[PDB]
């Protein structure tokens, strides 16, 4: 995490450990629990607007340093699951929704996957800018994350890739998010 010259940091809609809820954020754990394939409106905040060309990248990494050096990718199952949108490659975990200019990358050196989008200042009347994400594999998929916790890294970079700000949050993709938030909230 690191707010830069722009005060870059993330924001989340408070939903509640209720039921029928498909996505809820836990301020205490700073962890998100969401159902697979459902939209998560994460917010972007800044005290100054980034220069034009600045982008927003979303990468998933493993929380525990023992698995730190392993690329997070969908499990052999979901990988062979026809549930694409026409943009995201079948092997990516984090997809973006709503944006018409998302870019799906794979670092040539680290092999890590990411989704980058153009940074856009908040629309009139809002104080923050939204980006709808989705996870396409459950935390409990064998071959996949396999019960291993992950952390979503959201970085604000300039047109040329330079880091301009970074923030993160742990995430859990489950069928029972609400329950899992409270029965973990402790
Ligand atoms: Zn899976």
Curated annotation (Swiss-Prot):
Similarity comment: Belongs to the p53 family.
Residues bound to Zn(2+): 75, 78, 137, 141
The name this protein goes by in its record: Cellular tumor antigen p53
Induction comment from the UniProt entry of this chain: Expressed in a circadian manner in the suprachiasmatic nucleus (SCN) of the brain with a peak seen at ZT8.
Its biological purpose: Multifunctional transcription factor that induces cell cycle arrest, DNA repair or apoptosis upon binding to its target DNA sequence. Acts as a tumor suppressor in many tumor types; induces growth arrest or apoptosis depending on the physiological circumstances and cell type. Negatively regulates cell division by controlling expression of a set of genes required for this process. One of the activated genes is an inhibitor of cyclin-dependent kinases. Apoptosis induction seems to be mediated either by stimulation of BAX and FAS antigen expression, or by repression of Bcl-2 expression.
UniProt region (Interaction with DNA), positions on chain: 172-179
Chain residue ranges for the region called Interaction with E4F1: 158-186
Gene from which this protein is expressed: Tp53
Span covered, complete protein: 99 to 284 of 390
Assembly information from the UniProt record: Forms homodimers and homotetramers. Binds DNA as a homotetramer. Interacts with AXIN1. Probably part of a complex consisting of TP53, HIPK2 and AXIN1. Interacts with histone acetyltransferases EP300 and methyltransferases HRMT1L2 and CARM1, and recruits them to promoters. Interacts (via C-terminus) with TAF1; when TAF1 is part of the TFIID complex. Interacts with ING4; this interaction may be indirect. Found in a complex with CABLES1 and TP73. Interacts with HIPK1, HIPK2, and TP53INP1. Interacts with WWOX. Interacts with USP7 and SYVN1. Interacts with HSP90AB1.
Swiss-Prot/TrEMBL domain comment: The N-terminal and C-terminal disordered regions undergo liquid-liquid phase separation (LLPS) following homotetramerization and activation. Post-translational modifications, such as phosphorylation or lactylation affect the ability to undergo LLPS. The nuclear export signal acts as a transcriptional repression domain. The TADI and TADII motifs (residues 17 to 25 and 48 to 56) correspond both to 9aaTAD motifs which are transactivation domains present in a large number of yeast and animal transcription factors.
